[PDB]
Amino acid sequence: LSKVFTIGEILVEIMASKIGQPFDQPGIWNGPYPSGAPAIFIDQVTRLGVPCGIISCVGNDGFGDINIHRLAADGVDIRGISVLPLEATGSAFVTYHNSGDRDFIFNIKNAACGKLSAQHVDENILKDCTHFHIMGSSLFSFHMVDAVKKAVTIVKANGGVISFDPNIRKEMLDIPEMRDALHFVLELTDIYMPSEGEVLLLSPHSTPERAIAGFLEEGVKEVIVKRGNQGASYYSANEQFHVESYPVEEVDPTGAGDCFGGAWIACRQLGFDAHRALQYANACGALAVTRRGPMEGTSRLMEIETFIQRH
Amino acid sequence: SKVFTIGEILVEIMASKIGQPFDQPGIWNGPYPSGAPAIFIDQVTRLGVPCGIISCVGNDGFGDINIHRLAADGVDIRGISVLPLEATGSAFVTYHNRDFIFNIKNAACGKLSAQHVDENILKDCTHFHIMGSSLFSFHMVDAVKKAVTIVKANGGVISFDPNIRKEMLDIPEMRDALHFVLELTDIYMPSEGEVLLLSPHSTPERAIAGFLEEGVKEVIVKRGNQGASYYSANEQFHVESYPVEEVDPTGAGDCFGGAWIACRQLGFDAHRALQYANACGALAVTRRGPMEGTSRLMEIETFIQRH
């Protein structure tokens, strides 16, 4: 009955079929593919066998259906996904440069996703929610923050746990309203999971150490740092440790952080200790980047176990 | 003597296979320049008539493919505003035997307003064409109203193609906007199925007659595979349809209109203009792609001769 819930953008991704393919010339594209950091995160949670749900908004179109179908089939409680007739399901077109850099044409802010208001958050859907996960990338409007704030109040009310992944767009930091929202969340966060490049973003300090130790002082219980292709680290007032990255043929990093986080949250729900959870989250993130597609790199528990072993 | 239009500019993404669904991973072709006003204006420039368009796109590749196509074809694109915070509109389509996923209303093209209509850009506009499909929001209506009145007050001619989605007729504000345009229309170009839409009359003969009496000077009726007709107080005549393998009619009606307007600008009498329009429309349907079916004068005349 205990459930892990997340909230945020759900969209489909349409990928360029060839590297170097431009946006301003006819070509071949592949998709749609289920996507959206919160959706990818929750999909990893369900594939690990942990009952979960997601609060989102999609339009009444096939793009919205493919996401709902995928999540539902994978075991996710999809009741929290409202369908908006007068809106188009968010999307994202992506191309690849020879350098490895990606280019996107996003439609999220002015699509169904950016419609999610505090009213789409039903207290009845979060009754059995003991753990709520927030994606920084979701906070791009006041309506979004309200929904998130409402949900967090409801979950902490029933004694739930709050985790927060600051995977935002740096630009958002130059907006006072959104700047506060992020800090507001950080203050109510028990589990903080920034990537190496985001540790200082929400910190008054200038060094990762001070930043991490600062977070713990503020009230954060755990800080998990994803160091891209350099491993990751676990930080708690009582302990501290790190694991190394696995050497893999990177193909698509789009959802490596979401998968890493899904594995961490789910593994911890399954009783794993911080050390086991960390190596698994790391292995999960590593396995994810090896497959093309935002949500096509998720893994089952023993696939992660085996990945680790064979290495 | 310049022709202008206004409205949605977007890119179309096409399913690679017939029967291909929107909810399964597949292969798609695109983007392809699209949007009724853009298709219409492209056909105009390709026939050698100076023209321009007023629209809004995003600061992205989808916005660029449209601007570049029109510019390279000779269209005056100074009227196309680029909106940094908006995504250029798009449309995914799949066939059967038809179905779409549209992002227009809440996209860049849906932000077009009176503010984006520069009276100065229309200073030398002698003919302004309105696509009914463009009237989907108060702001779009305000843009159209400002543009039409400027041109009308400057002695220009107004053409109007009611290529609307029947839905809009159930919305009073949009219903009233369509009448606004009709009220100031000189050349009305409804397809056979749109003839009675803006008329209080129940029969087409009576409707057409009503439009001429209300102020319209010319009514051109697009009858798809049944040819087309021309109606004015001075005369009435019809042409038969050209039998052709129809592949995609998404822009056939736009090309027809573009041909009629451009040809009249070139000095064609009503009969010759109707013949080229009819032929231009026939040629457009034979190809897949919104704007991939526009033709140049040589093609239209070569097609005609062969028949």
DSSP A66-90: HHHHHHHHTT-B-TTEEEETTSPPE
Sheet of A239-243: strands edge to edge? A81-84, A52-59, A3-7, A129-135, A161-165, A191-192, A222-226, A232-236, A239-243
Taking CB atoms and an 8 Å limit, are B31 and A23 in contact across chains? yes
What phi and psi values does residue A274 have, to the nearest 5 degrees? -50, -35
CA atoms within 13 A on the CB side of A307: 22
Residues 6+ apart with CB under 8 A from A111: A11, A59, A87, A88, A89, A90, A91, B103, B106
Chain B positions contacting chain A at CB under 8 Å are: 13, 16, 21-32, 58, 60-62, 64-65, 68, 86-88, 90, 101-103, 106-107
- The shortest C-alpha distance from A234 to chain B (Å) reads 37
- Of the candidates B137, B179, B181, B177, the residue with the CA atom closest to the CA atom of residue B159: B181
The structure tokens listed for B292 are: 């991939």
Query: Is the Cα torsion angle B98, B103, B104, B109 positive or negative in sign?
Result: negative
Interface test with B, best of A18, A103, A105 (most B CBs within 10 A): A105
Q: Are residues A24 and B61, on separate chains, in Cβ contact within 8 Å?
A: yes
Residue of B nearest to A32 (CA): B25
First CA to last CA distance, chain A: 36
Residue A123, burial from CB neighbour count under 10 angstroms (0-12, 13-18, 19+): middle
Other CB atoms within 10 Å distance of the CB of residue A69: 15
Cβ pair B62:A23 closer than 8 A: yes
Query: The tokens of A28 are what?
Result: 């071949």
Q: How many residues does chain B have?
A: 307
Decide if A195 contacts A225 (C-beta within 8 A).
yes
Q: Which amino acid is it at B192?
A: E
Say yes or no for a CB contact (<8 Å) between A61 and B101. yes
**CA distances from residue B100 to A6, B20, B52 in whole angstroms, order as listed:** 31, 12, 28
Q: How far is B74 from chain A (nearest CA, A)?
A: 18
The rounded distance, in Å, linking the Cα atoms of A311 and A288 is 16
Tokens of A277: 């959870």
Q: Contact B22/A66, CB-based, under 8 Å?
A: yes
A26, A32, A69 ranked by CB distance to B29: nearest = A26
Task: Give the residue from chain A lying closest to B90, CA to CA.
Answer: A107
Enumerate the residues of chain A whose CB falls inside 8 A of the CB of residue B23: 32, 62-63, 65-66, 69
- A63, B101: Cβ pair inside 8 Å? yes
Q: Do B108 and B83 form a contact (C-beta atoms < 8 A)?
A: yes
Exposed, middle or buried, A86 (CB in 10 Å: 0-12/13-18/19+)?
Answer: exposed
DSSP letters spanning chain A: --EEEEE---EEEEEESSTT--SSS-EEEEEEEEE-HHHHHHHHHHHTT--EEEEEEEESSHHHHHHHHHHHHTT-B-TTEEEETTSPPEEEEEEE-TTS-EEEEEE-TTSGGGG--GGG--TTTSTTEEEEEEEGGG-SSHHHHHHHHHHHHHHHHTT-EEEEE----GGGGGSHHHHHHHHHHHHT-SEE--BGGGTTTT-SSSSHHHHHHHHHHHT-SEEEEE-TBTBEEEEETTEEEEEPPP----S--TTHHHHHHHHHHHHHHTT--HHHHHHHHHHHHHHHTTSSSTTS----HHHHHHHHHH-
Cross-strand pairs, A33: A13
What's the gap in Å between the CA of B88 and the closest CA on chain A? 9
Bridge-based pairing state of the strands A27-35 and B26-34: antiparallel
Q: Which of B60, B61, B106 sits opposite A110 (nearest CB)?
A: B106
Contact B26 A30 (CB under 8 A): yes
Paired sense of beta strands B89-94 and B80-83, if any: unpaired
**Residue for token digits 């790391």?**
A282
| Alpha carbon distance B170, B192 (integer Å) | 20
- Helix crossing, A37-47 with A256-269: angle to 10°? 40
Q: Which residues of A240-271 are buried (b: 16+ CB within 10 A; e: fewer)?
A: eeebebbebeeebebbbbbbbbbbbbbbbbee
My answer on whether omega of the bond before A176 falls inside 30° of 0, hence cis, is no
What is the DSSP track for A18-44?
A: STT--SSS-EEEEEEEEE-HHHHHHHH
Residues of B in contact with A111 (CB under 8 A): 103, 106
Residue of A nearest to B67 (CA): A24
| Residue B28 backbone zone (phi > 0: left; psi -120 to 50: alpha; other: beta) | beta
Mutate to test the interface with B, among A107, A141, A292, A295 (most CBs of B within 10 A): A107
Q: B16 vs chain A: nearest CA distance in angstroms?
A: 9
Residue type at A54 in one-letter notation: I
Nearest CB among A14, A24, A66 relative to B23 is that of: A66
Could you tell me if B265 and B49 are in contact, meaning their C-beta atoms sit under 8 angstroms apart? Answer: yes
Q: Helices A62-73 & A37-47, crossing angle to 10 degrees?
A: 30
Q: Which phi and psi angles does B147 have, rounded to 5°?
A: -60, -50
Measure in Å the smallest separation between the Cα of A12 and chain B Cα atoms: 10
Identify the bridge partners of residue B46 per DSSP, sorted by sequence position: none
Angstrom distance (rounded) from CA A185 to CA A190 = 10
Characterize the bridge pairing of strands A129-135 and B89-94: unpaired
Question: Cα–Cα distance between A206 and A192 in angstroms, integer?
Answer: 18
Question: Are the Cβ atoms of A91 and B103 closer than 8 angstroms?
Answer: yes
Q: Which of B17, B82, B106, B137 to mutate to test the interface with A (most CBs of A within 10 A)?
A: B106
Q: Report all structural domains of chain B as residue ranges with CATH numbers, in order of start.
A: 1-307 (3.40.1190.20)
How far apart (Å, rounded) are the C-alpha atoms in residues A81 and A76? 11
Technique used: X-ray
Chain B nearest C-alpha distance from A227 (Å):
32
Output the 3-class SS for chain B.
CEEEEECCCEEEEEECCCCCCCCCCEEEEEEEEECHHHHHHHHHHHCCCCEEEEEEEECCHHHHHHHHHHHHCCCECCCEEEECCCCCEEEEEECCCCEEEEECCCCHHHHCCHHHCCCCCCCCEEEEEEEHHHCCCHHHHHHHHHHHHHHHHCCCEEEEECCCCHHHHHCHHHHHHHHHHHHCCCEECCEHHHCCCCCCCCCHHHHHHHHHHHCCCEEEEECHHHCEEEEECCCEEEECCCCCCCCCCCCHHHHHHHHHHHHHHCCCCHHHHHHHHHHHHHHHHCCCCCCCCCCCHHHHHHHHHCC
Distance CA B36, CA B6 (A): 9
Q: How far is CA A24 from CA A107, A206, A263, B33, B111, in A?
A: 17, 41, 38, 10, 21
